[PDB]
Design an enzyme around this catalytic site. Sequence first.
Site: not given
Length: 419
Positions: A23, A115, A120, A397
């Site tokens: 991250n 995607c 938004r 992952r």
Amino acid sequence: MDKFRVQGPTRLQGEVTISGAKNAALPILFAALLAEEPVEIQNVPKLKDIDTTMKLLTQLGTKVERXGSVWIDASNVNNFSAPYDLVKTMKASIWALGPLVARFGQGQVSLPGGCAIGARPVDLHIFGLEKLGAEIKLEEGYVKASVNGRLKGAHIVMDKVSVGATVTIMSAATLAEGTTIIENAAREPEIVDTANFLVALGAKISGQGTDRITIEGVERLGGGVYRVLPDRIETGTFLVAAAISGGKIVCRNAQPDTLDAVLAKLREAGADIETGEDWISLDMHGKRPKAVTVRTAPHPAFPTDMQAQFTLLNLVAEGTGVITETIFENRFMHVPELIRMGAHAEIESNTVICHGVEKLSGAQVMATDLRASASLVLAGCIAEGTTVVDRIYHIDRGYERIEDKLRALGANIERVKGE
């Protein structure tokens, strides 16, 4: 389809070395698009996303290689387009956008199915870029970004806290002309990491970690060596692994300060926790955890990424504890799985009322969410009998060799290929 066959119960104890946070590695990797000089990103976990990013970076004209570090030479980036085939499996790809436009006045990233970029009413990435002076276009399955000349510092107020967009804006603002102030900035340790990375490149950033990030743009970013911060969620996963098994564990290569809420929660659960500069020790003293109340909320509050793990904790804890999601209100797929393992829980709205049981039972379980999945593996470690966790590629992952890690912790785990 890979599966984890776990034989329980096994106390999870010993040591684990925490991997670098994907991250943080990700945005840092994309941030490296800003660097004109070689960059060495250290402590990068060996995870699919990193490879995909490397492949994407190379596609951009980036010279990339990896081992423990990922070596980046973005000096010659010449292609400003992240193509479909290269971004298809990875949303993080949107991160190429800001650096590209910031450094090269132009950039584009493919928008594969699923995607939600631009979906938004106010897409934070688009918004921030736009605020910086970039013209954003959603065309031909691409989010396109262009700016005549340089980006301009702007006072950007993020309508929602967004790690993703915070990285994009912060990253891009490093090369913008002027000062950019990001309000409602994501506070994640990964944001701090990325900002620190940037600073290592010569960017001027302050406030990382707080709701306000101020970036004083510079003309160029150089290179440098930057060590990706420890995976706080992996750490938490490991801490929970010991907490739920009466074990004592020392997390090496850790960063205690990214885990305040989690450690506090663990103490609540009865964990004996100690911390050093780069380590966290968790000792259950052979004790079953005490049920706790968990409420996920934006960092530095309790992390939703630890939510399933703590649900598991509660599920084998003494007493009834409530897990509350204020972030991913329905992020409870691990629960029905755990229930098949003998766990007692009621999912009520955005909460899981956990009724801790002494011992789980092996079952065949599957959760697609990586945390839930890892939680299931953990559950299998402490469950009576055999637990088969399906689709563990999910774990693969986000966790670097969790099998190896758990095994070294005493887990009886086996990677089973197909069936």
